[PDB]
Amino acid sequence: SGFRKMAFPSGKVEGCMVQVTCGTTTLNGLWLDDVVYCPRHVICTSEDMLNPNYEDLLIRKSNHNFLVQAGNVQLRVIGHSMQNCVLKLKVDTANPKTPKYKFVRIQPGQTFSVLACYNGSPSGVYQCAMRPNFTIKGSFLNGSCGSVGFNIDYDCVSFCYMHHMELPTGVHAGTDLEGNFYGPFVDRQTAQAAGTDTTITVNVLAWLYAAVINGDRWFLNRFTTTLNDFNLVAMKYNYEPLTQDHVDILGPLSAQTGIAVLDMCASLKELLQNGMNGRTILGSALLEDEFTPFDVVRQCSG
Amino acid sequence: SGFRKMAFPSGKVEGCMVQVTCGTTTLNGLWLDDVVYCPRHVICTSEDMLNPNYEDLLIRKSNHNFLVQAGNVQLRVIGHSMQNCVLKLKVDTANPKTPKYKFVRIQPGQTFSVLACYNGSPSGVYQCAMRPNFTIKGSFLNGSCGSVGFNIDYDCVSFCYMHHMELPTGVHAGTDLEGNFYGPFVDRQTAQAAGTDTTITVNVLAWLYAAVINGDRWFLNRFTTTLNDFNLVAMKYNYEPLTQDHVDILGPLSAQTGIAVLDMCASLKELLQNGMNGRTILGSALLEDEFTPFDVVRQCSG
């Protein structure tokens, strides 16, 4: 029993982290087979960052302008290219620790593990969700750029996030591993604003099912509601509308606990209307929304 | 910026996890050099578990009664011994992925990362504190026994916890890697009760300093207090007494933020007396006590 913010074991990703240096700029790269992936703003000076023309800046670079370091061993760059906002550096050595992997672009509300790195070296691992406004609430300092987010499925690592920048609000923005930003952001040093965020409704509901599975039941009630009446309450408290696809995704949890989805929605409505009144759920005093239905099934007993 | 429950990268420990089978009992083991460490109750049947005589049960075992599996490759057991509540199995192969490591016995209030495993295979990683009552609030299912907790310091893995059992309250009990239980517990299947728990005061204070470092300042006040007057309030709300050693440990955070420790204590007193009144700190609606002063310095900017 018990319920924790749980990350995937990070070893398979740790074996891929390298350091990329261009000039006086240093950040992290991802070394898979004979290619290193990193944020393209590694080629920018502090002055270039305010309004870069990346095609211009890259054409002025050659292979020997890039220093890749795997541990203390330097990797020789033999080619370089640009794909959206990621730089690809071909090296002369295939990574012998390359896991089985895929690149995936996730939807808002999905979670992933982040291996935070500095100067190519892993420092810590934590769980994140992609917020509905396409930021993540990460923990990142200067030099963390190029750290990746991932999920693992049967020894296959699915990379879904590469870290690029921190916004003025302190939240974080980045790309998929093909270099496409999540959200409307661009890789230049200007003050950029994310849209207003919302709460991930299907995840809150998943986490209420985790609580029931773990013996927290004080919030349940006998009532039920309709999808339409629930969604009126969701709008009022800045929750995402509940879709029929999300009801179906919650099927397995609903069946394991005997609590129909719309039954659990009535409990959530009461929690939104009355608060918790000093009580906690799974050790939390607010409604948690960064556990997907899959996260709950993975962590909880059957 | 940002603040997350952050675990250590788990790869170095992942390379040490094996599966140990004795009869119909299977659990996890830790393979370091040519020795496998696991909970000694692997030698117990379901009937033996109610009141075992372990010396009796072990003398009735031979090396070929133990099946160690590292991946699909079986390791041959060449010796076996008992050290307190851990079983040691000498195998004929030294683990080539053995990290630099140490065994350490931690104090209550210290944190560590847990690599939760099943059938020798790592499933997830999370952060725990050793509670003042010597339990941990883990996330563990059947088959997780033998999972270890650890910290990492400059590529040296310090193992501090091996998982043995879940108590009736759903919390978790285990040993150091020399097999000595944390707390008064014993490895038999009886209903055992932990003492009443308390809140880790020095950690709450550390986390308030993390919040200031991350720009949450709404809870600060101009007041200060004495160690003696604070400790009266600590008693009232079931917080551990604040010691002078703990004040000194908070020195670096105090200096980085300009807020003297006893100044921060006055803020905590007001938070205990008045609650948060609908506001959050570092995204939490309660006072978090599983971040040590070291955890905060490690994760936060200088």
Ligand SMILES: COCCCCNC(=O)C[C@H](Cc1ccc(F)cc1)NC(=O)[C@@H](Cc1ccc(Cl)cc1Cl)NC(=O)[C@H](N)Cc1ccccc1C#N
């Ligand atoms: C309200 O309380 C919260 C307080 C929040 C305070 N937060 C900040 O002051 C961070 C600022 C906010 C900001 C300010 C003016 C702007 F005009 C744009 C953004 N952000 C960066 O300075 C950006 C600037 C930048 C670089 C390169 C690119 Cl492509 C894009 C940008 Cl925006 N630096 C990077 O992201 C680095 N790479 C990594 C880094 C460096 C330093 C600290 C964290 C990180 C991280 N992670």
Ligand SMILES: COCCCCNC(=O)C[C@H](Cc1ccc(F)cc1)NC(=O)[C@@H](Cc1ccc(Cl)cc1Cl)NC(=O)[C@H](N)Cc1ccccc1C#N
């Ligand atoms: C209030 O809401 C919370 C609900 C809590 C409900 N929780 C439980 O029912 C778990 C029970 C509680 C209990 C009941 C009667 C007793 F008499 C003693 C303890 N605990 C175990 O059944 C013990 C029994 C046991 C075995 C071996 C030894 Cl040496 C010692 C013990 Cl105590 N099984 C193990 O720990 C396994 N190894 C691993 C395991 C197996 C299953 C589920 C988790 C785990 C884990 N992790």
